[PDB]
Amino acid sequence: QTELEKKKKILAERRKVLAIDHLNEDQLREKAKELWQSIYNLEAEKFDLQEKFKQQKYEINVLRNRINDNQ
């Protein structure tokens, strides 16, 4: 590692000590639950986008056919 890579590595670990390191077991259980619900919600929006992508490729292909044939 150099120094920009050292900087990014440290500022990411600092992001965790600021959000986590001052909590007790009960205060930290509620935090993990809180963080997991964010992951669930983000994975759901990723799933919805993956399906939309599969469908666009079909619409793109059909439009590719129509231009290909109408000339």
Binding site: L28, A32, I39, A44, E45, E59, I60, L63, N70
Partner: protein
């Protein structure tokens, strides 16, 4: 070969199961969503974990939020370029292309 009233009778039914296979495909995607989310966002097992392992879990969950959010941005951007070029194609293909009640109430009435 067959009457014009039949060929419309068949088309009305064609669109009726093409609509029932559209929304059957919907719930098949809803169940496919929960099954996928169960493997990706596994529910938490917090009982029995010590403070050391509670804190370790809270930290890797913190790093996973940032990771999944850019895994989602990368696919969000792909569907954004698709929308733009969908509009391009849909456009470049367009650039290549009395009253019953009134009439019956006037002559009769009831």
């Amino acid at each position: 070969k067959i009457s014009a009233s039949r060929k419309l009778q068949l088309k009305t039914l064609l669109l009726q199961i093409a609509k029932q296979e559209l929304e059957r495909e919907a719930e098949e995607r809803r169940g496919e969503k929960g099954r996928a989310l169960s493997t990706r966002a596994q529910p938490l097992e917090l009982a029995g974990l010590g403070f050391a392992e509670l804190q370790d879990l809270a930290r890797q969950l913190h790093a996973r939020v940032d990771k999944v959010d850019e895994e989602r941005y990368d696919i969000e951007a792909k569907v954004t370029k698709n929308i733009t070029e969908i509009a391009d194609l849909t456009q470049k293909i367009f650039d290549l292309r009395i009253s019953a009640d009134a009439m019956m109430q006037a002559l009769l009435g009831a």
